[PDB]
Amino acid sequence: VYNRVELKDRLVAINRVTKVTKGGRTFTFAAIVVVGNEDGVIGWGLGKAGEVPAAIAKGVEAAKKNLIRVPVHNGTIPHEQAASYGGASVFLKPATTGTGVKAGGAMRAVLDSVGVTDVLAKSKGSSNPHNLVKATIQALAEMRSPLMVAQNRGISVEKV
Amino acid sequence: PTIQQLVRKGRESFADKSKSPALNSCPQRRGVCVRVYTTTPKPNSAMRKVARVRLTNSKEVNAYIPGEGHNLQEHSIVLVRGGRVKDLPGVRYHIVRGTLDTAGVNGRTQRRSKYGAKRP
Amino acid sequence: MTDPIADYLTRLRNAIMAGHRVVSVPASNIKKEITKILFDKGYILNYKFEENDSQGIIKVALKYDLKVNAIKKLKRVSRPGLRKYVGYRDMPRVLNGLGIAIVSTPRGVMTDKEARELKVGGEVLCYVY
RNA sequence: UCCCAUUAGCUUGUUGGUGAGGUAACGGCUCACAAGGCGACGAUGGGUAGGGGAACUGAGAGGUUUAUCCCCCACACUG
RNA sequence: UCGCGUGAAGGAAGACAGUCUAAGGAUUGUAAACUUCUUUUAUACGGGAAUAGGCGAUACGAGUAUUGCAUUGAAUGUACCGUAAGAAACAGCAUCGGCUAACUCCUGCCAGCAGCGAUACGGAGGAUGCGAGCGUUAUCCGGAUUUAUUGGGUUUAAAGGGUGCGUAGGUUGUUCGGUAAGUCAGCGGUGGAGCGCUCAACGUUCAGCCUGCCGUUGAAACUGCCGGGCUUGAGUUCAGUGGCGGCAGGCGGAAUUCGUGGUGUAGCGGUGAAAUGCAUAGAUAUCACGAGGAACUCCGAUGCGAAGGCAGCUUGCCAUACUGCGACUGACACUGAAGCACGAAGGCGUGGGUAUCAAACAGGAUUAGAUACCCUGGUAGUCCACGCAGUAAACGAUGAUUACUAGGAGUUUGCUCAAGCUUCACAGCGAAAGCGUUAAGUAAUCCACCUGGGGAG
RNA sequence: CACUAGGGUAACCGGUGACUGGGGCUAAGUCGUAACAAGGUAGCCGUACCGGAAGGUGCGGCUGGAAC
Ligand SMILES: [K+]
Ligand SMILES: [K+]
Numbered sequence A: 001v002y003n004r005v006e007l008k009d010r011l012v013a014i015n016r017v018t019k020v021t022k023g024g025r026t027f028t029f030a031a032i033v034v035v036g037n038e039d040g041v042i043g044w045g046l047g048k049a050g051e052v053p054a055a056i057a058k059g060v061e062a063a064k065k066n067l068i069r070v071p072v073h074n075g076t077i078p079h080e081q082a083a084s085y086g087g088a089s090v091f092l093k094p095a096t097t098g099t100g101v102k103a104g105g106a107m108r109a110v111l112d113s114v115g116v117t118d119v120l121a122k123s124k125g126s127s128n129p130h131n132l133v134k135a136t137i138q139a140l141a142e143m144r145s146p147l148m149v150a151q152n153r154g155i156s157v158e159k160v
Numbered sequence B: 001p002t003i004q005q006l007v008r009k010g011r012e013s014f015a016d017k018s019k020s021p022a023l024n025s026c027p028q029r030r031g032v033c034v035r036v037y038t039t040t041p042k043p044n045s046a047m048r049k050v051a052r053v054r055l056t057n058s059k060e061v062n063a064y065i066p067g068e069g070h071n072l073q074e075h076s077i078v079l080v081r082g083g084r085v086k087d088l089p090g091v092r093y094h095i096v097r098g099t100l101d102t103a104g105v106n107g108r109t110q111r112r113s114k115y116g117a118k119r120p
Numbered sequence C: 001m002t003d004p005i006a007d008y009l010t011r012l013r014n015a016i017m018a019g020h021r022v023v024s025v026p027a028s029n030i031k032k033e034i035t036k037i038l039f040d041k042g043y044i045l046n047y048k049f050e051e052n053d054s055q056g057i058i059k060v061a062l063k064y065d066l067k068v069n070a071i072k073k074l075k076r077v078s079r080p081g082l083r084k085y086v087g088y089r090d091m092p093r094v095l096n097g098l099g100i101a102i103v104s105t106p107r108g109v110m111t112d113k114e115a116r117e118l119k120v121g122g123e124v125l126c127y128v129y
Numbered sequence D: 001u002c003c004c005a006u007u008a009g010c011u012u013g014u015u016g017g018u019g020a021g022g023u024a025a026c027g028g029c030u031c032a033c034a035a036g037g038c039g040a041c042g043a044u045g046g047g048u049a050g051g052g053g054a055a056c057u058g059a060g061a062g063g064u065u066u067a068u069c070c071c072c073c074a075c076a077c078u079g
Numbered sequence E: 001u002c003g004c005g006u007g008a009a010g011g012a013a014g015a016c017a018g019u020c021u022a023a024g025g026a027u028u029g030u031a032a033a034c035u036u037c038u039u040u041u042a043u044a045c046g047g048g049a050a051u052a053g054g055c056g057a058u059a060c061g062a063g064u065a066u067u068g069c070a071u072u073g074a075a076u077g078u079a080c081c082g083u084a085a086g087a088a089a090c091a092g093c094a095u096c097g098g099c100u101a102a103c104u105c106c107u108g109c110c111a112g113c114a115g116c117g118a119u120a121c122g123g124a125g126g127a128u129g130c131g132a133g134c135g136u137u138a139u140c141c142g143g144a145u146u147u148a149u150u151g152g153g154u155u156u157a158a159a160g161g162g163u164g165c166g167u168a169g170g171u172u173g174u175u176c177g178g179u180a181a182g183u184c185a186g187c188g189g190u191g192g193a194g195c196g197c198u199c200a201a202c203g204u205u206c207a208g209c210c211u212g213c214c215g216u217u218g219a220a221a222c223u224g225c226c227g228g229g230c231u232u233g234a235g236u237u238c239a240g241u242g243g244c245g246g247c248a249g250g251c252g253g254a255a256u257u258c259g260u261g262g263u264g265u266a267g268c269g270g271u272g273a274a275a276u277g278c279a280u281a282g283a284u285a286u287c288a289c290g291a292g293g294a295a296c297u298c299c300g301a302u303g304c305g306a307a308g309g310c311a312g313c314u315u316g317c318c319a320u321a322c323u324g325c326g327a328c329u330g331a332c333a334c335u336g337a338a339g340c341a342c343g344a345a346g347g348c349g350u351g352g353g354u355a356u357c358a359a360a361c362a363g364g365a366u367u368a369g370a371u372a373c374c375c376u377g378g379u380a381g382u383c384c385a386c387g388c389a390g391u392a393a394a395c396g397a398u399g400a401u402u403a404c405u406a407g408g409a410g411u412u413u414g415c416u417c418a419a420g421c422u423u424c425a426c427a428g429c430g431a432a433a434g435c436g437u438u439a440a441g442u443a444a445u446c447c448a449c450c451u452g453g454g455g456a457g
Numbered sequence F: 001c002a003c004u005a006g007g008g009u010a011a012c013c014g015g016u017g018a019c020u021g022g023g024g025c026u027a028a029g030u031c032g033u034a035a036c037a038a039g040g041u042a043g044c045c046g047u048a049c050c051g052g053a054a055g056g057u058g059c060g061g062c063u064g065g066a067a068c
């Protein structure tokens, strides 16, 4: 995964995460954030702070710190790709130019942050936000451009 | 399983049961009020009005009476539809208000069509 | 052995996973054809055939970048338990045209591109990309 | 071209041959030697359905159901 | 199901409702003042659906004129006055979801879920959907991959048969030729753009699939079949090395039980403490002789067997494994539904035997009770032979076969090498614990099994 | 020859019956404490015998057990 170290922020989900102590229950606040510039660079992070704005800010900082470069062309994907992370599995396929993003939720947030316009996306695992976004970014990272495939194989006129 | 195992045996698909089996794939049935009594919910502690009714399809069931104030009594012809009550074991049917012997709720000004009350 | 072609694909895949540079195989005619197809399509560095007292040996030197192999996935399609036959009008595209499918045809053993050019179908041996 | 092996053997004109009769017509269709035929690729027995194109509905795989319409089959209180 | 109407443009913050004595929402909403009539009503004109005697002449076809003919029906449509005049409901507003003040109740109630019993119940005011409809119930599909060929799984969530042998069936190392069953190809037969509805649903026409079935010609890479080959898989032979592998016959010492006799006398035994029990008509202990039954200390943690299992010594008869040969045959292979065989302990039947231990049973203790745990007795059983029975946490909770993929620490045998035997541990796998060359990694073949929990094996 | 009608034995599909036994859910009134910690006698599987009841004991097996 090429790290490639302005991107807008998208809040995927927040969680009311608790703790048990003899005195009582102490509550934290977690948040998954994805940063992207709709260009081919997307990062994700997890903020774990007390207040909701503090958690969102920490997640934004973590997502900005951890960024990768996703090879894209126009607004579609070069080929179909399936990837599983944890209890979640994702499948992405290219679609027609006048189709838009056909998926909702964490998949929609990740694909909007990466800027892909036309894509057919389906989730076959669980609806966990962490594993879902991680599987989607893994699927995007394992994606090879036609130029990259040509460079790895040799000649660039292999498709003929 | 292997391809030959599937060829020899195949796959078996079950049938989903119907949530209202006493209706016999009908929207509503007609019955007579065999008994009219009151039951206690399974953390609610109310007094829910129910009627044991013998339907014309040769079946006896328990039907809840929604609303406040029922003019029904024993040996009354009622219209019974589907729909169960969560906090009451047993009963799984409702009695339509404003049909046959059952009368509409008096003094109702909202949700009138669900309790058979005309426009005032 | 049950599926020698699947065994050949598995040997190649295991060598790629282990990051070896060469891999040896007990030779066969259809496997000689498959490795020739792979070499002319640009997935391995080179090959060599050694005709010994046995059926023979195939030695394949794989292709690595300046440390990623040129081959990403090998998938056997027509297994003995379920044979797959297709025509030229219904032949499949592997990795949306960026990968190949080795196909045995009455005109010989070639890829899906050459098979669709020659208008002939047959057995789909494997998907390679 | 539906389920049941908590349905394993079934059939005695049943399988074939000769001859005759009968039929619009071939034929155990019927009437006067050899013995067979059919079954774990499900005979036989039991339960339930009229069958298709349509129609509805799934990216596809398909599936559901014959409400109107069209084609075939069966029937006209019961034999 | 489709289409239309219930009016169109201006008119400041009336009266009456709410929420706060004024302000905000209803609200440009009403009231008047200016036009239009789709539509309703009254009148008139009113289509379309209706097309079907001579003059060639082949003497008859056939081509040309005329005649009446509408159930729908004042029905489309067209036109004329005088008028906004005749025409809007239903659901839900705490989250999922679009939409919030006040009064009730504090049971009555409501719910698809988180549930509230109120930004959830009932009303009043406003809000939000849809709209001649709006909701409730019933039925069927998709999301559901909740039967998974495309497209799931079985160590611990449901899920590997107790283990083998094997029938039908499924699968088939390498190579040289034939054939054409599967497969592939060709040729035949068959089965979106307009137009009209004033628009639309809807009618109607052509471009467009026939990609299902059948016939007829060709191709030979792969599967199948036929005819030969090869030795690497498989098997046979030979040599070496084994072994708590099976069956059967003999031989043993320690401990312990009983009977009969020497010595000897105030207790022994048991428990947390005791007691029930044995013992001066002679115990425990101790020395002998006689008669028996059961189990095999040290080695001893490792090895063998398909599994269950197998341990004193020795012999006989069997089986089997591992390694190699320059010996042989030539794919003879894998798996395996039915069936068959074996299968711990406990249990059953007949005949033996019967020392220890010991269900049931009896007594003594502890407890509120003790139908138990502790103690003392004690019969089946535990042992042998033959025959039934067919179960287990029969477990590595992990089926068999084949090929491939990293390192460390030990160990046994055959000699640094190859078999086997167990724990840390790359890639990879997994939900995680973890597995990791003896995989739970990468792949192929066949079998067994799972589809929410009880009911219920 | 067979449509029926008649007797009789045999099936299958069904009702009812003096009396006699499981299961589910709601109450929880009573009686004990079996399991979860070494749950106060480690637990569980098979089998046999015996108890108001959960259970107890004997024989073999397992760790899905402590503790040494
Ligand atoms: K480990
Ligand atoms: K207890």
Ligand SMILES: [K+]
Binding pocket: F041
């Ligand atoms: K205990």
Ligand SMILES: [K+]
Binding pocket: E394, F061
């Ligand atoms: K065992």
Ligand SMILES: [Mg+2]
Binding pocket: none
């Ligand atoms: Mg389990």
Ligand SMILES: [Mg+2]
Binding pocket: none
């Ligand atoms: Mg096993």
